[PDB]
Amino acid sequence: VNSFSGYLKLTDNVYIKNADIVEEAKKVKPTVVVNAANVYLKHGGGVAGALNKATNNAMQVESDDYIATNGPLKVGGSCVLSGHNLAKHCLHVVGPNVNKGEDIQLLKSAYENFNQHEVLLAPLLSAGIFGADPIHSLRVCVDTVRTNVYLAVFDKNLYDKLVSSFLE
Ligand SMILES: COc1ccc(C(=O)O)cc1
Numbered sequence: 223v224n225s226f227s228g229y230l231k232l233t234d235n236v237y238i239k240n241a242d243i244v245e246e247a248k249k250v251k252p253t254v255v256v257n258a259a260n261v262y263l264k265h266g267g268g269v270a271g272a273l274n275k276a277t278n279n280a281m282q283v284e285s286d287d288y289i290a291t292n293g294p295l296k297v298g299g300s301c302v303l304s305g306h307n308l309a310k311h312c313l314h315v316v317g318p319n320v321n322k323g324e325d326i327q328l329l330k331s332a333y334e335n336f337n338q339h340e341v342l343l344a345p346l347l348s349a350g351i352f353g354a355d356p357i358h359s360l361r362v363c364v365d366t367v368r369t370n371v372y373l374a375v376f377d378k379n380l381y382d383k384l385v386s387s388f389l390e
Contacts, residue, residue, distance in 0.1 A: 223251045226372045232388050236364050236371050240381035243374035244276045247308035255309035256344035261294035269345045277306040298331030317348030333366035341370045357387045
């Protein structure tokens with residue numbers, strides 16, 4: 223039903239909220255939730271681990287089946303799998319891990335996957351353990367994505383920095 227509420231307009235197609243993306247997915251029933259994935263679709267921590275836990279491991283079993291046919295995803299790549307109880311679809315997207323020397327330029331590729339979907343509930347890509355500056359990631363999202371993105375940011379201090387950078 224894509225019942226988004228309380229999202230702050232950044233641009234005509236990019237919205238942001240200080241929220242837990244799992245709790246958003248349950249309230250919003252989005253067509254697409256984006257997972258911040260790794261190439262093996264192993265949902266061991268961060269957003270991935272949270273989404274998977276909220277599916278009680280349904281997401282991990284399906285992800286394994288996919289990886290059995292595909293092998294690992296490419297950096298900047300994606301796959302569309304079931305959203306289970308969280309969403310119709312989960313778009314698993316792999317941003318570059320800059321800690322492992324993956325090039326930050328691949329972040330554009332990663333966000334370009336969002337343009338295959340009219341409306342998404344998403345995290346910021348390559349944040350947290352993949353080591354990209356989250357405000358940089360937001361700029362790449364705004365520059366790259368032309369479909370309607372609803373970004374959930376868990377941490378209030380980071381949320382305020384993002385909104386301050388964008389609007390002040
Ligand atoms: C709860 O997540 C969803 C959202 C949309 C749909 C649908 O439109 O079919 C199904 C499940």
